[PDB]
Amino acid sequence: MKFNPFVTSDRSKNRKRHFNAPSHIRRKIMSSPLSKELRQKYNVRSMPIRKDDEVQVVRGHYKGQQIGKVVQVYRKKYVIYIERVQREKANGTTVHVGIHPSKVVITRLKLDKDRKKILERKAKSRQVGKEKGK
Amino acid sequence: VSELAGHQTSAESWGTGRAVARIPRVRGGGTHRSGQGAFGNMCRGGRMFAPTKTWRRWHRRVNTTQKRYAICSALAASALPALVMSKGHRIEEVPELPLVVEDKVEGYKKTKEAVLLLKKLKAWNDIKKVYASQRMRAGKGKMRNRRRIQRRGPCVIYNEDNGIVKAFRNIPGITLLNVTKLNILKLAPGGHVGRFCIWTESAFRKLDDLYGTWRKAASLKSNYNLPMHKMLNTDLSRILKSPEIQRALRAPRKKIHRR
Amino acid sequence: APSRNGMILKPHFHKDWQRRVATWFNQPARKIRRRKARQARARRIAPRPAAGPIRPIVRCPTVRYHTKVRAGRGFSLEELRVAGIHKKVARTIGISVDPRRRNKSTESLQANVQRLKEYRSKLVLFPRKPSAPKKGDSSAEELKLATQLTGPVMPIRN
RNA sequence: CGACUCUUAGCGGUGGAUCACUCGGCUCGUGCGUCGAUGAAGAACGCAGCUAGCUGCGAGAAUUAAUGUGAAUUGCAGGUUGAUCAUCGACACUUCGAACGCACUUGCGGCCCCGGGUUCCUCCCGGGGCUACGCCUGUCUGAGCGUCGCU
RNA sequence: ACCUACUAUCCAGCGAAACCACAGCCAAGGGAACGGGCUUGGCGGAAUCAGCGGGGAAAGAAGACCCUGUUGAGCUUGACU
RNA sequence: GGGACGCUACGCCGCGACGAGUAGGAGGGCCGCUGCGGUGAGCCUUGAAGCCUAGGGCGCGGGCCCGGGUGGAGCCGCCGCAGGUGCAGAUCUUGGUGGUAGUAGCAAAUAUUCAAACGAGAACUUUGAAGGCCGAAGUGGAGAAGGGUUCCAUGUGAACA
RNA sequence: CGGUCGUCCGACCUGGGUAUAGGGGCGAAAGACUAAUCGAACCAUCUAGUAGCUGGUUCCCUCCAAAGUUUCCCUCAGGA
RNA sequence: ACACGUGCGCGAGUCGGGGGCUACGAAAGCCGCCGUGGCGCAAUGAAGGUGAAGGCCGGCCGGCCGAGGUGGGAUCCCGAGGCAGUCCGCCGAGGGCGCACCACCGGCCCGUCUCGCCCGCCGCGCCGGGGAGGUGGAGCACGAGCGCACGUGUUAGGACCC
RNA sequence: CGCGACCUCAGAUCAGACGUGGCGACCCGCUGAAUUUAAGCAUAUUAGUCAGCGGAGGAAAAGAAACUAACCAGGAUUCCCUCAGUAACGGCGAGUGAACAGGGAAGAGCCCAGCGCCGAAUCCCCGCCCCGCGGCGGGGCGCGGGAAAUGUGGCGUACGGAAGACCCACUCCCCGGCGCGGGGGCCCAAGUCCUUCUGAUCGAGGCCCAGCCCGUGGACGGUGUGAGGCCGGUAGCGGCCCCCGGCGCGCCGGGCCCGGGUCUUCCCGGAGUCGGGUUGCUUGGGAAUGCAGCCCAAAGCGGGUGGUAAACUCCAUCUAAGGCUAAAUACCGGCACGAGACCGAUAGUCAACAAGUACCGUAAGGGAAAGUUGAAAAGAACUUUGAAGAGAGAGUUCAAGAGGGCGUGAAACCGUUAAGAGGUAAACGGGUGGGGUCCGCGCAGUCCGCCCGGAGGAUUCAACCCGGCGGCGCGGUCCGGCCGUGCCGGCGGGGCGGAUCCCCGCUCUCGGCGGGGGACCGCCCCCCGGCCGGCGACCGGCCGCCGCCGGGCGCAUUUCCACCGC
């Protein structure tokens, strides 16, 4: 159960927030878990994805162990585009197939001044549950 | 339904003649809704017959003695093994149906302790039955915040709260109830009686003070005693073949005399 | 059109009563609002009693009720004059005062004076400043034992 | 067997009935409970690279600044010392509109001050600040064979 | 009685509406007192075209002529207020 | 002094008599719809609801269960609860479709014909010629009110003419 | 709409502006006109006005089963 | 809102519905020194007001019996009898206590009419009251209502729909 | 006349400010019907109602008695229950219809005029200083101006107040400055683990000894059907970072010398106002309840009220004709929320969508219809006919039988294929018959028990021994526990209750009063003890009997399996 009286549990209202979320909220919804090798090193469960991140596909028709990078993040479709995840058009051109960020695991990140700042901050409060909780 | 529904339109019947059906109709206009029929429950749009009001008698009041009577009947039927089986509870491995547990479980603060307690008491099979009963609801309730339904589980009754509510509320089917504040809606779900109940030691001893015995009234109610029985020996099979009746009976006639 | 046997009834529904219909769905929410404001008031006057100032012993008019005793609006000036309490100082120490009340009897006048005498004994008065306790305040040990009184202060039992 | 016509079934046309879906209504409850001459509500007209409507905005015109956030927007081209979103406390806000120079033609003014125009010399042009009613205190200028006082 | 123009006729093209319980051959009988359906008889044969006004108590509009309503309106007066 | 069935007792069994029906009344529905509390360790992408069906059936009946096809995501049985719960009509409302019917009709103001160009396609477009009409109170040339891009060039024959 | 008609120098016709607004206007007078509406215009509301008067009133089975008669009512198409 | 019938809890009582205290929960539980108040427990009269059995014995007083009767009354009780000789149970002519309820005759309470004899006090009369016989009351005569729910019927509401 | 005050009255684009309008769900003050009912209708009722007008606020209004009552008296206003469908009004008809008291929510009181005392002791503006300056605030200086004696400020308001004398008592309250939880933002647990389906899994099985792991987190939503562990989230008195005034401390600029009791002397109240007559409206208010127009028009041991008009006489209760004031209360408008036994595109707001939009009327105004491809456009490349619209191949998809108004695609209606039939319009009920349609998966027709036969094959029967379990017992009454919706006893104890009978305190050491004993009685619980009953709404051990199971033997004329006779 949820106990916060100001937190919505309505189905129609929750779908309204999801489909009409602003762009800075759209990035937060598009978070994907890190690969298992990253997970002990950074102590971070999941993370929003950016334009240049190495991606394995876990579910769907394009799942496998192949390593591909993101092409662009299409926040209007809840869709990201991966390098070699693409299908053949009729005329001979190639079209990138959209994969939802939920069926995405990140094997390598895109380190930055603002990217690195979240890593200790997400790993800070991750530890706090192990001093206060213990 | 809103009281302005079907009444915001301005309409007037065309009267007799004009080969129309005398219904009030929309006053003019170069649109589809023009002379189309506004009022009446038979027409498209407009008011429906007998609009529901907010002042319908939603609530009902019950006598205090009758409210306390069903709780006594609900508690008494929870100690008979045959009635609880008819509620579907999978508790055939429970050692004693009046399940009385020590007062140490109030100090529980983790759900893993509560799960292990149910495994040790062999009541986990009813919670395991709850998992098999989880399915999305039939009908229009799925889009009205009633998407998922599940079976009732065992009810845990505690005298005092020291963390037992926190450690038990995450297990589905588990419903917590205070001793002084009982509820017939959670002791007899659906109107049927005989829900599986789990009691603590202080919970099990406080029942003699909230309702009393037949020779001593309740110490926490102002004026309340246990109701009397209409009949005492309810097993009429023992009564019917008892010797005292059997003398003053005629010979049974069981020879079939057809036409 | 009446039936065979029945009453003659006068239903007062010939006005436009459906517009003026007062539902009572606010009642469960109103009770919470009354309780929360009452609890918030008590914390504002945390040493003072939650009921408020004391009420006098009052006989009823309307001979139907003339054998009953209630709690009144305030103590009369004659009752305060005998008790030796100034009318402008009694209101600061939690005594209900009104100048409208009379004193035709002596038993009720003496009952409220006796009621005022036991209130002055039970009243723990804090000093104006904690640095300088004055003459008419309570002892220092009574400061540590000052507690809120739940319910009506000195309930009037018939 | 014919052509035509009747019944039933299959398939194909018209049609959107039924079902399942819902960023919408309806009802109830809680907190707050705030408009304007420092120009309200409302209306008109304009503003995007390609934009008819909707939405947003006001010549700084699908927004300026600041803060939070942190690698996009996207239908198509274009270009980390902060793109985009949200917050919004600074700045700005065309014309009517209580609407305020007179009227509502968008026409005519009046006063003061600046720049070309003078070389203040009258103009002309452009720009900036004022010019609605009633009323309160106070100031100034006044009226009265109203009541007087001193020459 | 005859002549002319535009229709009506047919064809190329485009193309509705009113109306429609089911639909439509009659004699007599009875019936709610004038039947397409019922009874007894006369009888009866695909699909149609151009006219035609006998019938469908034909289509048009909950009869305005008459009466009732304790339903109204315009008007008049020696009706009531 | 070693042995058939039975008995949801709101169940089972045996005797006799009776069975019309408008208005109207009552009772029984394991008749039907929707949602809620229980309940079926219920059904379900190895196929839910809905729909069609020359199949097998059940019940006097309201209706219901299987077989086949389509369909792609929910649904039902039992115990109680509650209702905006069952249509053939109301010159009912909304929407759709028929016979009429390829029918009435495309008939007010004298009239069009030939050749060439273009085009896939010409009675209706363009050019030339012929024959006509409006006959200056015009079927001519410009205004006001009103219309508001209808005015001009190019292109189209999707919708209208 | 066609033919046939009355008048066509004055009580003639007509454009624009303006004034008279509903129990009111205006009327060479017809109960005529007042935006296809006139023996009281149009829009919205009271209003879902009332109707002893017409029309309709939705699943099955079983059981029982009528009355158009008394009296009274401004009662006679209705009620008690 | 009312009437009747039915089901439930309590019972001469019954009830919080208004108010306080302790996700579902706006639920549920608790508070009668929170039962104020609603209905019933007493009616009658316009009102002032009044306001619900008697008998016997002894000499208006003192003791006793003390809650009406008759007929019909489902059920229960006895046993003349009968299923060498006792117990159980059976039934049984006949004899009784009689539930509810019906009919009748009485008795008591309030108003009214008529007729009297009287007594008596805190203020002795135009005073206060009793008695007897008729009559009117929606009365008494060993309670039955309260609260909730359901169904039907009549209404006021838009009121089966146009 | 000159000159100078003062009173009235003007002018300002004078200096500084104020009002206009909108919304209007709730509130206040006016105005204000007719539909309807009375089976007609006129008083009534609808109804102080709809409509119209003005004015605000976050609440408004009302509000601290010229009150209610007749009691042993209560004591501001507002709201709920009750009073009560009552008193009362009403062609006394339909109908209308309060108030007191009581229980609750809340509870806060006060200020003027006048009477008088203080030397106008008062206030506004302008200029200067100091300090904060988005509310120009305070204090100081003004022979700076003005208002005010046609009355400002302090004391002071019916509960009395003012002055003087006598006692008592603390002298410290309050403005403009500074330094010492709410709102917002960012994050925090655990499987995408093995097999298996699907186009995709969130579908199925498993993950033993931690029946995977987390759970104070198994609400919800999204992700290619159904997910606690994929993600956002959720839980948490969880973590981190900012803003807000706050609560109290300290410093200074500060005003700040204050009252209560006794005695004496004084003083003190609101005018075309109350009230009366009349008229109209209204109310339950009835010989006017309330409001309003006109006329008359007051008084001070006075005036008002005491629900029938009046006179006389006792009382009872307040002090009108001046004003302020939060809380309980209402809220179909607005801001931001949470929720639903509600409805599901002819439903639900008119409007789920470029909806008050398209469109209509000169105008006031009227006012629609309209959701769904697919998981992802992967939206059909390319070839060919046709001028093209449109096709035929090919291709995408799980599926084009989802191909751009595209999910599912019913009926009316139409086209085509198959079958049957066809001069009394068609259609229907009963009874057959014929033909199709698929089905029975029928095509050699039942098996089940008991007995016999012979072929076989077992580790096999009965009876004994051991162990466990269960049932019953009238064990005629074995022994012990536990309970009583059983009773009795008590040099018993407690906890209570009682409408049974010494001490602490107060208003007049004894008499009165409230509270606490103690004793007595009654109930409950416990220590027990004695009976009764039970363990079949509820029990154990020993003994006896019986049954079952497991293991040893017993070992084949016993027992159990398999096969056929027609």
Numbering used by the authors:
A (entry chain AL26): 1 to 134
B (entry chain AL04): 54 to 312
C (entry chain AL13): 2 to 159
From the primary publication:
Toxic dipeptide-repeat (DPR) proteins are produced from expanded G4C2 repeats in the C9ORF72 gene, the most common genetic cause of amyotrophic lateral sclerosis (ALS) and frontotemporal dementia (FTD). Two DPR proteins, poly-PR and poly-GR, repress cellular translation but the molecular mechanism remains unknown. High-resolution cryogenic electron microscopy (cryo-EM) reveals that poly-PR and poly-GR block the polypeptide tunnel of the ribosome, extending into the peptidyl-transferase center (PTC). Our results demonstrate that strong and specific binding of poly-PR and poly-GR in the ribosomal tunnel blocks translation, revealing the structural basis of their toxicity in C9ORF72-ALS/FTD.
